[PDB]
């Protein structure tokens, strides 16, 4: 059973903006890039929501790599403990997506936290999701494609 | 209501020095130089106190990123925790503004702490500024322009 | 006294591939890559079990280094605490053999831990071996070449 | 008061090498071998011992830096906490003196624990010294020349 953020947020306007702030040593800034692009798209087939990349600046969905305390309420510690977190669709803060850069990632070629799929499952908190109580969502809260849980999940709220 | 430290210690010269030791990856030297500037300045208008910047040995106010245990009873901690610290007026230690290099800061266009807040909240410390009580204040405890309590403050210790 | 893991899991193919697929800032690449032969080889010259190196995607037995969380379970930790982890013998995590990189590693010429002598116990347990008893055992569990425990208890698996 | 070690541990002969192992990235090499060969000779002038330097493989006094564990018992922690241990003469780990990276270290320009400092009491342990209950003592617990319980103490054992 997939779940969504309590008031049930979710992004409002035609298109949402987001942008890669940073990154990590781990790998190529470009991986990073088409990585987040082929994990907002997995969500973004399912729904009438466009997004649309920017370099610079603010964006609605602010994603980044970030060692210790980093500018919200959720410093990150180190390594081990958590590993990333990001928020629900709203303004400032909302919808932004941050990982831990004192972990290992990797794009499936070494050894690592999978990017891609952690990147999934960020975005889909990014977008309203909630975690599921379904082994097989991408949204469970424990660790490719959308399970029929995350899809009947993200329609339902866009819808 | 703004607070100043017990006893209410502050510089007693007319000049008072500064010197930017050590600096962090995060961002450009030059960016930090300017932002303390900026910071110190925000303070400086509002009082009979001028500060002179001096590029090494000892100043009066030292200021710098460090990590871990770093020649006071203070050490840094690594990512998260204790984030900065600075210490009211007086010889030595006093009057000096330590930040955690283990933490992520920015000036503003990229995820972190945002310095040039962080700097005038330390280096209002460093005049001899306590927390205050205001949540309008710059000197609050928790997280542009000084507040009218920063003002009346800083004023009256000096006023 | 020598111990298996439960259940005694063992390589049960003729050929077992082995990958270094991280190194250390603290080595050259090329020392790791003779040291984790030599930890094999000394495993290797007891038993009827033939190693082949692989220097790209997934090996039976995956070798590298870590920050943090890395994709498995067992995340580590920064310095100190957790050192290393490997798995028994078994698909997927079966197998591989990870070391923190937030410990300081050596082939000894330097400070650190020797890595021969972590890689040959490590490896020890990739192949199916778990802690001895005695003291003069290479999988003692606290810390050159195999003992007579170590031997008996490799060629009693394999066999 | 001074203190030694208990059974009163010291070197035994005329010459006693040391060897800097490994440095920090915080200051040039060449600085650390000075203030290393400073602080060796402050305790020297007292006694009839002869420190010998050597710059690889084994010496009697093994110095240096390093994060997380690193071969003995005693595991560094990251910033803060322990910052740095010394043995007692004797053979093996004996006599070494071991820093933690994970600090600032400073030769006294920039922020951070002044190495010429902590180097100077590190060594006193390499030597035999315990810590002193005079406030003015370099072996006292917390924290430039030798007080004068220094010197009655590292006489006495010398010796
Ligand atoms: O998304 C963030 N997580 O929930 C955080 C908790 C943050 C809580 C939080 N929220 C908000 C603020 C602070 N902390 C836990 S996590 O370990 O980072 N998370 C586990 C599941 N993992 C998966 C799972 C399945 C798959 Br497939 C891939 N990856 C994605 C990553
Ligand atoms: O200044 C230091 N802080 O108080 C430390 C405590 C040190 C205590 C301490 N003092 C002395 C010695 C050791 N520890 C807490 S902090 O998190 O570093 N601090 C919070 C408020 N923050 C703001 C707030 C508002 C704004 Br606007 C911008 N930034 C500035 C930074
Ligand atoms: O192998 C791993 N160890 O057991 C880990 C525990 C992991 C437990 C674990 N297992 C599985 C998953 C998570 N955690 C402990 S360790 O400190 O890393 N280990 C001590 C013995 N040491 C020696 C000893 C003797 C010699 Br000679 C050389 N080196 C090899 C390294
Ligand atoms: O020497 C090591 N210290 O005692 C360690 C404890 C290790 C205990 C230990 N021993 C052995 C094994 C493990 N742990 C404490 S320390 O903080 O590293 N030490 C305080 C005094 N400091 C001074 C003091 C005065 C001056 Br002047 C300069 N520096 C030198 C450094
Ligand atoms: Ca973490
Ligand atoms: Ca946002
Ligand atoms: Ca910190
Ligand atoms: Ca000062
Ligand atoms: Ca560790
Ligand atoms: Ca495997
Ligand atoms: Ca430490
Ligand atoms: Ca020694
Ligand atoms: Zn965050
Ligand atoms: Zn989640
Ligand atoms: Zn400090
Ligand atoms: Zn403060
Ligand atoms: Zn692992
Ligand atoms: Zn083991
Ligand atoms: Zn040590
Ligand atoms: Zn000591």
Not at 124 to 130: K, N, Q, V
């Amino acid at each position: 059973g997939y779940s969504l953020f309590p008031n049930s947020p979710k992004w409002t306007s035609k298109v949402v903006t987001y942008r890669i702030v940073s990154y990590t040593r781990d790998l190529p800034h470009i991986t990073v890039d088409r990585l987040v692009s082929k994990a907002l798209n997995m969500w973004g087939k399912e729904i009438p929501l466009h997004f649309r990349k920017v370099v610079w600046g603010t964006a609605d969905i602010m994603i980044g790599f970030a060692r210790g305390a980093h500018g919200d309420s959720y410093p990150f510690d180190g390594p081990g403990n958590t590993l990333a977190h990001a928020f629900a669709p709203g303004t400032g803060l909302g919808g932004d997506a941050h990982f831990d850069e004192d972990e290992r990632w990797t794009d499936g070629s070494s050894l690592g936290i999978n990017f891609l799929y952690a990147a999934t499952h960020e975005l889909g908190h990014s977008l309203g999701m909630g975690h599921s109580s379904d082994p097989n969502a991408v949204m469970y809260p424990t660790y490719f494609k959308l399970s029929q849980d995350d899809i009947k999940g993200i329609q339902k709220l866009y819808g």
